[PDB]
Each structure stands twice: as structure tokens, then as C-alpha cells.
Design a protein around this ligand. Structure first.
Ligand SMILES: Nc1ncnc2c1ncn2[C@@H]1O[C@H](COP(=O)(O)OP(=O)(O)NP(=O)(O)O)[C@@H](O)[C@H]1O
Ligand SMILES: [Mg+2]
Length: 382
């Protein structure tokens, strides 16, 4: 038999973890990455999932699906869906009220319910675990945002079943992050924890109260359309202007030039979280012109100043709704790949008057980490 695993099914990135020998192991994929893009792509000859999928989006924009988490368990008539679809390069049709993604696979036109797309990503995570564990993975704990209603939770459970996973339990993402740090241990009296989650495309702030081992989501806030992608876009717009300056050519119209530039920016951004400047080396970006440049962390922070700063507004609201003061929150844990940005860390710490931030576990692996632990206890492995 095999161990149960914990899976973070994210909007942009997903992650798998497994508790074994009192330690949690975050499993890397085929490309060696510890998190894999929640991307699925359909071509003439195959269906690509994960890195392979994202690594060809600029070439196959209408048949490469992403953001399935924004659709899952929702209706077509949903104002959310209606708004979101205005920015998706892939087709989304109404099917008796339910939204469906329409793609072209092997010449034939095919459609999928959002839960089917997510099951594909889930299958990828499962095989990643299996490759590592050297055994079949059946049981799993999958995470979901705290605000997900019954339909969304149902659809997520369904995605699991059709993926061949026996979903032991669906737990909230903030709660999984708290468990990763062991903030669920009984210490007598209440503990207020603030989960600051800034991922690839969403921002969630959750204030949890934990007494006797029971979690209570006191308040939540954030922005469904604020994430690392927005930071990348600011770099893109910055570089489009620079190319136009140096070569008097506007590459905006060329969707491929822009997507290749975005991929380069996202990578330079990650480097910036550990270095003061990074170089952008793109061969033959537009026409036959190579675009060789670099950005400094200062210029980067400067391009996103208003965005970074605005991050504190949802924090303030969460506090007031929860009826607490800065001084009353006991622990602050960082979740999401974007929390690795030094400026975001400074900004939050300054706001909480120097309080220490919980960030020893990679923020983008925190949710999976907690789910893995939770899976183990539910399986008697712990
Ligand atoms: N070193 C880093 N510095 C800055 N951003 C990073 C770094 N490493 C990863 N990221 C970004 O973090 C995002 C990935 O976040 P992650 O939390 O893994 O996603 P997720 O849970 O799918 N997020 P969300 O889209 O909000 O649901 C992307 O915008 C990456 O560029
Ligand atoms: Mg997330």
C-alpha cells in the first residue's frame, strides 16, 4: 500500500507533498521544479500538462488552458465568469448553464468542464508523487480557498475522483499553512494567526483564531485579481517602452514577442528577490533584433510601488472586520510565491511594527506542506 499525499491545487501553480518518517517531503517534478504550472495544452498530436504546457503557450494560445480554478464549481451566468472570460485566449461556452472550455485537440473540436481540466493537473501531481514514492498514490488531501462555497468544494472533490484520487478531506488553504508551522498544537488559550497569501494571480488575507486545536476563520480579505503576474506585466510595459526607445519599433502587436518578453521578466523577477539586478537576454525578439538589457531591484520596486503598498489595504480591513488590533495577532505566516519579494516582507513587517514573519518554509510550498501533514494524520501514518 502507499502513503496519502497533500496537494495544493493553485490558480497558477500546484504543489505536492508527502509526510514520511516524521518529515514532510515536497516532491519535485520531471523538470526538477517543486511546484508545477496549472496549465493544460492540446495539440495535433498530444495533450501537454504542467511545464510542457506553459512552455508553449505563445505558440498555441487558443488551445492552452489555465485559470480553471476561477471557473470550477461556478455557473456560466456568473458575473465572475462573464468578466474573467473577457481576458482568456481560450474558448469558454455555456452548456445548460455550466461553463465549458472549448479547445481543438487532434483536429477535432472538444470541450471540457472545469473539473476535468483540474483533474488533468491533479493526475500530473499524482504521477509526480508516484514516480518519487515508487508506489501508487490513492488517498489525498486537497486544499481550497477559505471562501469556496459548497459547489466549488464539490467540483474540486470531483476533479479528484475523476483523477483516480480518493479525497480524504478538503481543507482550507490558510488552515493548511497554519498546520505547516505547527500552530495547531494545543497551548492553552486562543491564538490569532494572520495568513498573508500573495500567489501568482490571487491575494488572500485570512485571520484565523485557534483554540483547543479548532480553527475559526475570523475574517478574510484580499483581491482575486492581484498577483505575481501583475508584477510581471509592469516589467513588460516598462521594457516595451524601452525597446521602442532604442529601436523605434513597437512590439505590442506581436503577441509572440510580448509572451517571450513576459517569460523573461518573470524569471528576472525571481532573481531580483535574491539579487540587486538581473539581465534580460532575448535573441531575435522582434524582426531580427536581439533585446539585451537588465533591471535593478530598485527599478523593479519602483515599477510596482503602488501595487506593493496597496497590499496593506486588505490587511487593515481584515483586522477591523475581525475586530482585532495589530498587537493582538500572535503569528504572521507568509504564503504564496510573491511573498519572497524583499519589499513585500519589509512593508508587512513595518506595518506590524517589526514583528517576526514566519517564512522558513518556502511560501509556495506551505499549503502543500500542511496538507501532507494533515493527510498523514487522517491515514494513521501520524
Ligand atoms: N523568487 C520569487 N520572487 C518573486 N516571485 C516569485 C518567486 N518565486 C516564485 N514567484 C512567483 O509566485 C507566483 C507563483 O505563486 P504560487 O503561490 O506558487 O501560486 P498559486 O498558489 O497558484 N497562486 P495564486 O495564483 O495566487 O493562487 C508567480 O507569480 C511567480 O513569479
Ligand atoms: Mg495559492
Amino acid at each position: 500500500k502507499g502513503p496519502a499525499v497533500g496537494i495544493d491545487l493553485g490558480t497558477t501553480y500546484s504543489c505536492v507533498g508527502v509526510f514520511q518518517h516524521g518529515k514532510v517531503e515536497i516532491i519535485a517534478n520531471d523538470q526538477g521544479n517543486r511546484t508545477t504550472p496549472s496549465y493544460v495544452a492540446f495539440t495535433d498530436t498530444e495533450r501537454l500538462i504542467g511545464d510542457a504546457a506553459k512552455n508553449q503557450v505563445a505558440m498555441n494560445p487558443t488551445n492552452t488552458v489555465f485559470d480553471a480554478k476561477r471557473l470550477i464549481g461556478r455557473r456560466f451566468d456568473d458575473a465572475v465568469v462573464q468578466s474573467d472570460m473577457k481576458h482568456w485566449p481560450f474558448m469558454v461556452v455555456n452548456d445548460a448553464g455550466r461553463p465549458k472550455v472549448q479547445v481543438e485537440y487532434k483536429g477535432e473540436t472538444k470541450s471540457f468542464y472545469p473539473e476535468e481540466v483540474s483533474s488533468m493537473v491533479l493526475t500530473k501531481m499524482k504521477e509526480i508523487a508516484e514516480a518519487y514514492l515508487g508506489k501508487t498514490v490513492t488517498n489525498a488531501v486537497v486544499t481550497v480557498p477559505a471562501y469556496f462555497n459548497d459547489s466549488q468544494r464539490q467540483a474540486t472533490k470531483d476533479a479528484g475522483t475523476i483523477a483516480g484520487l480518493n479525497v480524504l478531506r478538503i481543507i482550507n488553504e490558510p488552515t493548511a499553512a497554519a498546520i505547516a508551522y505547527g500552530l495547531d498544537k494545543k497551548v492553552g488559550a486562543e491564538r490569532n494567526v494572520l495568513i498573508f497569501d500573495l500567489g501568482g494571480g490571487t491575494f488572500d488575507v485570512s485571520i484565523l483564531t485557534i483554540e483547543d486545536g479548532i480553527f475559526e476563520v475570523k475574517s478574510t480579505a484580499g483581491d482575486t485579481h492581484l498577483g505575481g503576474e501583475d508584477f510581471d506585466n509592469r516589467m513588460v510595459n516598462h521594457f516595451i517602452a524601452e525597446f521602442k526607445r532604442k529601436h523605434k519599433k513597437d512590439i505590442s502587436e506581436n503577441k509572440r514577442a510580448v509572451r517571450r518578453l513576459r517569460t523573461a521578466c518573470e524569471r528576472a523577477k525571481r532573481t531580483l528577490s535574491s539579487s540587486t539586478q538581473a539581465s534580460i537576454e532575448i535573441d531575435s525578439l522582434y524582426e531580427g533584433i536581439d533585446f539585451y538589457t537588465s533591471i535593478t531591484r530598485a527599478r523593479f520596486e519602483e515599477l510596482n510601488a503602488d501595487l506593493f503598498r496597496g497590499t496593506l489595504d486588505p490587511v487593515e480591513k481584515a483586522l477591523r472586520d475581525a475586530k482585532l488590533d495589530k498587537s493582538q495577532i500572535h503569528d504572521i505566516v507568509l504564503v504564496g510565491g510573491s511573498t519572497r519579494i524583499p519589499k513585500i516582507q519589509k512593508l508587512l513587517q513595518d506595518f506590524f511594527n517589526g514583528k517576526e514573519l514566519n517564512k522558513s518554509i518556502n511560501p509556495d510550498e506551505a499549503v502543500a506542506y500542511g496538507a501532507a501533514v494533515q493527510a498523514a494524520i487522517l491515514s494513521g501514518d501520524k
